[PDB]
From a paper:
Many bacteriophages depolymerize the CPS of their host bacteria through their tailspike proteins (TSPs). We demonstrate here that the K1 lyase from the NTUH-K2044-K1-1 bacteriophage is a polysaccharide depolymerase that cleaves the CPS into oligosaccharides of 1–3 repeating trisaccharide units with the retention of the pyruvylation and O-acetylation. The structures revealed a compact, rod-like, trimeric molecule with an overall length of ~ 128 Å and a diameter of ~ 86 Å at its widest part. The structures not only exhibit typical features of bacteriophage TSPs, such as the central β-helix and the C-terminal β-sandwich domains, but also contain unusual features, such as an N-terminal collagen-like trimerization fold and a striking protruding domain from the β-helix.
The purified K1 lyase crystallized in the P1 and C2 space groups. The P1 crystal contains two trimers of the enzyme in an asymmetric unit, and the C2 crystal has four. Detailed structural analyses are mainly based on the P1 form because of its much higher resolution. Only limited structural differences between the two crystal forms were observed, with an average root-mean-square (rms) deviation of ~ 0.25 Å between all Cα atoms, indicating a rigid architecture of the enzyme. The N-terminal domain (Glu10–Pro70) of each monomer folds into a barrel-like structure with a five-stranded β-sheet and a six-residue α-helix, stabilized by three buried hydrogen bonds (H-bonds) in addition to hydrophobic interactions. The central receptor-binding domain (Ala71–Asp559) of each monomer folds into a right-handed parallel β-helix consisting of 14 complete rungs, plus an extended α, β-mixed turn on the top, where an eight-residue α-helix covers the lumen of the β-helix, resulting in a well-formed hydrophobic core. Succeeding the β-helix, the polypeptide chain (Asp560–Leu651) loops out with respect to the subunit longitudinal axis and is organized into a β-sandwich consisting of a four-stranded and a three-stranded antiparallel β-sheets plus a four-residue 310-helix. The “rider” protrudes prominently from the border of the β-helix and exhibits a β-barrel-like fold composed of two three-stranded antiparallel β-sheets plus a short α-helix. In the trimer, three β-helices are packed laterally through the β-sheets b2 and b3, forming a parallel, left-handed superhelix with a triangular hydrophilic channel at the center.
Author numbering:
A (entry chain A): 10 to 651
B (entry chain B): 18 to 651
C (entry chain C): 12 to 651
Amino acid sequence: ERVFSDLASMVAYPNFQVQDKITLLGSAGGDFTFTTTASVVDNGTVFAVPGGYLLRKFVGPAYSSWFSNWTGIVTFMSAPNRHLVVDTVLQATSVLNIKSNSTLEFTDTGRILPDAAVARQVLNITGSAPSVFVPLAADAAAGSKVITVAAGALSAVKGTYLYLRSNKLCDGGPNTYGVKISQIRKVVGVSTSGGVTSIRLDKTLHYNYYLSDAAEVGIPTMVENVTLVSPYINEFGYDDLNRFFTIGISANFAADLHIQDGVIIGNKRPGASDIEGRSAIKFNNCVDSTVKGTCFYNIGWYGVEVLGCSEDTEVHDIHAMDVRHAISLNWQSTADGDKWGEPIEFLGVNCEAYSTTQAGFDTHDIGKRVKFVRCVSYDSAAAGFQARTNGVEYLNCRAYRAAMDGFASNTGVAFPIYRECLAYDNVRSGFNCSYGGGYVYDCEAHGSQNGVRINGGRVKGGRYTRNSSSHIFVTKDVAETAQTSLEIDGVSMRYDGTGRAVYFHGTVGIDPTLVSMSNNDMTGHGLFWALLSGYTVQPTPPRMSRNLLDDTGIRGVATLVAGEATVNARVRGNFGSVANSFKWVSEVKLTRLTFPSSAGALTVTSVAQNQDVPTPNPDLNSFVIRSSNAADVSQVAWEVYL
Amino acid sequence: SMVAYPNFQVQDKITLLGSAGGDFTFTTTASVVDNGTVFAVPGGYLLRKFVGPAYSSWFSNWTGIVTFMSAPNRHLVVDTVLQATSVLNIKSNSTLEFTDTGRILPDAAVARQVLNITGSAPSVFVPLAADAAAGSKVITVAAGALSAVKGTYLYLRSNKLCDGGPNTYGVKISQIRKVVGVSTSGGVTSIRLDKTLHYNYYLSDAAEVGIPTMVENVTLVSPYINEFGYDDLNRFFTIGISANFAADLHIQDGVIIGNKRPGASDIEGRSAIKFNNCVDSTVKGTCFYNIGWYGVEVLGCSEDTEVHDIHAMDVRHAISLNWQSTADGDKWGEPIEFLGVNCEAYSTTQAGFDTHDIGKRVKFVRCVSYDSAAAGFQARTNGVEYLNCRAYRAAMDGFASNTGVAFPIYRECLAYDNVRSGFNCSYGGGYVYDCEAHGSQNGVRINGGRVKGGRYTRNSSSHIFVTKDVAETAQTSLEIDGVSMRYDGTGRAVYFHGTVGIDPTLVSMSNNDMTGHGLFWALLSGYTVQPTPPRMSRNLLDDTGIRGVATLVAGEATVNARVRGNFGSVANSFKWVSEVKLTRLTFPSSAGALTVTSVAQNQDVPTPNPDLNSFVIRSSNAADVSQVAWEVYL
Amino acid sequence: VFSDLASMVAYPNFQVQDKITLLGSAGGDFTFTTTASVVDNGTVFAVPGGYLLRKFVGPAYSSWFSNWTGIVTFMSAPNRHLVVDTVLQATSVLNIKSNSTLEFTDTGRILPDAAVARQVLNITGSAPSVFVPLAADAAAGSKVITVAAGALSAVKGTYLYLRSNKLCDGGPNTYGVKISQIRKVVGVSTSGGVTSIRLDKTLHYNYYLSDAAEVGIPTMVENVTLVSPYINEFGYDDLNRFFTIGISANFAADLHIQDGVIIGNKRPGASDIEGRSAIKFNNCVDSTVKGTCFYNIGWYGVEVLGCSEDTEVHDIHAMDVRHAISLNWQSTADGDKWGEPIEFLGVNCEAYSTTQAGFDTHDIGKRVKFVRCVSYDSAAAGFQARTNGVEYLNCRAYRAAMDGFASNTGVAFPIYRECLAYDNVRSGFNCSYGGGYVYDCEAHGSQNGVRINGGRVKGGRYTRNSSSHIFVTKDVAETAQTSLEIDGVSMRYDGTGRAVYFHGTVGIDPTLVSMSNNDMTGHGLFWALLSGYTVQPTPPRMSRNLLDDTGIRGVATLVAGEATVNARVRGNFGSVANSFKWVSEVKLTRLTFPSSAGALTVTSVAQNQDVPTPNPDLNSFVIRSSNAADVSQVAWEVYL
């Protein structure tokens, strides 16, 4: 039974015995056990004394308020299997490394303030790539459950990881840097027969790993099962104290790293220029890792940066304000040598971005199986969403007030897919997939120069309004890009006092006959449903089927007399030869409703359009129904389409 | 008795027993007594020594718990059954967490609120120095007009009216923002905000800004308010958890029960959870039973609010975004950016999921309403979006708008056995995309907009009902495209309501599946003169006798087929006939232009046989011997 | 004070007033008591004269306990919160009771007994011991049920279990499982000899007196939270260390399982073992599994059966299991069974290398939905529906050995919305058993993109399918063909299969199919495949499809009432049984209006037949007028 009023008194005491009950009072107080066994001093949980060590007695988490200084915190977390609650405002003077099976948790008022003297990383979760590789014993196709190596070449330990690579190029996107393939897999079974060890993986392979590509495998060092609960890195007012950092949380070769909530603020001054590499959270070669609920303010580079062969990565519920990209999947520069890995299986869901300096949500030109679900970007300085890898899918995303395009692909990028996405008041376009096609399904764009820019693919369903030039702009990024077939079907693209329905860009080589337009609502555009520019000669129109161009004077019944009737109706057409125009006429569907013996074959002719000045009256447009039988007196139903 | 003890000295080492007691320190420094972590004793105070959370079991009384929570930076674990006699206020950077056994029983002597999380409105406003349009990252005020501290909040308002919906009360705009940057130059202070402005804030509307005192960063973990059996004890409350001017309030799981008797009448204002002027706040997983008013009420300028995974049973609305009555003076704020996801409602006394007539960017995703006494879902603000929601057995409509409300959007929503209709957007248009309605009087009631895709069955009157709430509402164009609305022994495909002035020519019907309806694909009532029909393009009406090949003899062939039409003049009917598509398959020199005539329909005496209906293909060339493929559409 | 526990518990003269401390392992403060206590050797110890109780606030810790037996004893009561901060070696089932939480630190584990395969965690209520008849019919949607006054005592906040002889109606129900539901009492009143019991949730079947509808009081285990359960560990198979069921729940309410890892009740990649599911929910309500990972499981990852209602499975990863998720039937071979799942959500789940279907139901269950789930490398299907009207939203199947998505014998109309199927061997979607609704889906890399006997294929996109994109067929010839709408589908030629294959062998009538506004570009004369017809069948109705991309719109000027137009007009006019007779729809619109304007028609369709490669830029048709003087300019558009 030994009681001490302060730390210095306790640690100077020379008479401790192992059977003693020991108590410290004050801000780091607690109960202690004396031992002679060599213990790792950290001045919070272990203290040196004459004759041995004092060990704080506790179950559950450790608390930062137990520690004398930052140095001790770093020492404590240098070991695995730690649970530390940050319940004080810590002043960092070095990087804090976190090891396997560890949790760092913050209370409402816990903080790590970075060092104002030197910009450095705050939290590191750092594994490493293999130092040596062995060849696969045989090719392993995509979908393989097992890989094989020569017996004894590699220690395969169940529950640990392997890192596979080859010279095959990443294939998710254009991959302009020529990044090579890699994947991280967990060993779940092992068997050896005939000199070959067969290693069963948790997940199957997503590329063909071939010996002709020097397919090989090594053992990485992973940091696994790290939880960061409510990390609070820096604090508002940081810019008045010149207090910054580089990367907030940097992970490399981590597995099951889960980041929940928290706030990461201020590795640049508010509203200031971007700073290369200064991402808030960076996942490099991480597997089964997540960021859920974290908020980001005033970040020099990306909110969450995902690169290398990061696989089964998810970002949910983040709010990112004044950052370069809220989320960016990244490439790796091969300027200085080979690099390996693209992200595979990425989900961003229910995330919000405000005032990004570049695209709200971004990929670079590699990555596979990338999905964004119910994300929203507001007031981007560039695009709301930018896809640079192929076939990125967007489900129910929204972009508001982007300086350029709500959603866009980019040079050489193939067919992003937009489903029920909504674009409002983006300056240039709602959707810009004019670089290499797009699939635009049930989307809406309102308040742009053009609702969609597209060179080929499909615009199916959806609704477009308040677009000053046209609702759909068939164009290219550059003239060299190939136009492909474009279907526009079931789209509501009515006239609302603004632009035309569809703009064909002759300037860059658009052939309108590669477009087909079926069952669209183009009501109100009259003779001005199309905009054309840059044509040297009048081009042939798209195929057009059962579109709606007018809402009045569009169905009725006529009675022939002597084989003919004149019908007043909003029939329409252009019969001129002006180069930037189409020659076209309404499709008038005729059906016979009485059946005299003089019934003949019916046709539409004599289309006249009222050109009263200054205001034309389309209700005095007319056409003639003529029968091949000059005695025809049939009643004929008529319907006017485009 | 520890507190009555005469002679404590600072050095003295201290222990309170009693299984919920502990270790203590003496001090003379002034401390706030709560009889749980701090006690007055002659000469000074005893402070409990602990790290991590406090526990309710440490406190002698509810009043001590209240005093403890009256300060910010508190973490309290409720590990006992607490008997409230006053409101528990929670302040910033605080957590209230309940164990499996912890509970707050409401005050039995006074029905009152249980939890309050209450910030305050600004005490003074200053005008904006310049117009700030929607999308503005910065606002300006005269230098020295107020002190804007980075990390703190601003409350902006003007006389511009909220614009999310009809706004019949004339609620004015407001928003709450966080200061992230401040610069002063040339007598103007420019304040950079976390999030951009969502309205124009104009000097002409007396745009102004003040500093609210927010309660920020509160977490309520598994709140258990009241318990089953409460009604036998006559133990109720008014509002369970009331928050105003809060930021980052997060409520997780828990159960809130019983501010009315089970199945009893509603009580105005008795919401389980109320969010007024709250930002970045959420309710996830909570369960609600026997609530007099709304499960989660959301009002004022609440922005970026989410409700996930709740279950609400015997409540007025599970979720309701609200208006504010301006009868006694101006009010400010509509909700902006609201998500309800994966929520369930049972036996609501009014709509399952609701808005009033203001609110912007409101979305409901995979929510479900069962057995509502009114609608499953009610939109009273404009452009509410519903994704994959479901309504079962509502007493009126599965999904509905209301008077004056524009264009709800329904995407892949499903309506089953709702008495009146699946979807009722007859008040001001609707967009009904790939939806389904089964088991109603009418699948969809709609005055204008779009019904695209989807599938309709078991509707006794008709699948689609083109009508209005009142004859004075405008009919607008209606597209009906790609809809499956087959005959299944019940109603017709489309009902045109002449009584309220519906002009069928404003309707267009393309590529729908109307198989089986025969001559009775349309219902019409209230027409005094036969109306002109909708445009119709390549719909399916029959599945048999609908494609073949005919050979002309002397320019003619008679073809048996399920061709159909009505040629009469009855006011409540359409004159129409099949679209028969003809294509030539052989190419004699006598090939002429082709036409359909002599449509005849069988009228056998018990049941007509449409396989014996016929038409004639006639050529303009009297010697034509062409083979002609024919296909029958509506 | 003491220092080890033989030492503390040997002490012969404890009295109630003593202040006691154990130093070292499992250390803390204690007090003495003479009241009968449940010895657990962690929080309660027997001592000369009575018992020592550990003093603490908040959770207990497994590090406090001398052995597994004590852990089991502690958790045998309700209202327990235990943190597993050690590696526990199980030798018996751990039962968990109401209002309890079992939480694991990253290193905490339960290692199963290597000597005997048994269950690890049990959360076990019980069915009623007695039932009483309903006093009146209670239709679906009822809020209240009635019983004779005094027949049963219904306590607010407790539960009821309702059943009748009516058969479960979610699917084919080949075992004849009967209906049941679990409901919570929220109100009770009695009048005129009848007790009316108000329920939390409404009834989802008609409960009729003619079906012997009855109700009893089950004993539920309620409010159990399992935080990060870690069951078994990698390398278990080297120690022959297995189990049967990992977490088995029956008659539980508000059981919530968060994260954790369950591994190894079979050897890696070994044969399935009947019944050895990782998690099993039987007759559970308002219960969830979120985040859990599963490896090397003999049966199902999550098994859901009985009248489990309002069950959700989110965010799981399952690798080397029979099914990741399976809703189950109950065999009635030895007697009557009751209950089908009602209201089930699977969201954001991932399956790899399942030995059978990735995500599964058997032939009962109502209101089943899978959202954003993904199956990789299934040895059977990615997704299998055996109950009626299972809905799939934005789900993905990759490289299944059979079908990406499939129904099965006697199963009606699964619904696929925006689902994606890649490189599944046989098909992307196989709903050829009983119809399907295939909406905006994609299938790439299969023998056939979709196999279907009736229903709708609407929208979507199909590529790289070796036989055809759509296969109109049946499982067996006895299955009914119903109408099939194919509309708005992109099913272009890309060097692989045809657009649509009509299976005459099983009696497919092509006229029951309608094809409108599809993109069939590139297929030329080979847009259909037919087999097993003995007589040329009549084709589907076709409306405004795209078959060619070049030579498909122009303007012709008639001369003497005719113009020859070179265009990619197409048709087949032969009689070969496995072929259709058909021709392009050429839409004609007059652009000039001479007095000699007559009615227009297409004739003389001529198609180049150069060997080995035909040149369709040499195909032609003639526009002919009824007026031999017609000189009209005529717009022409070529469709299928």
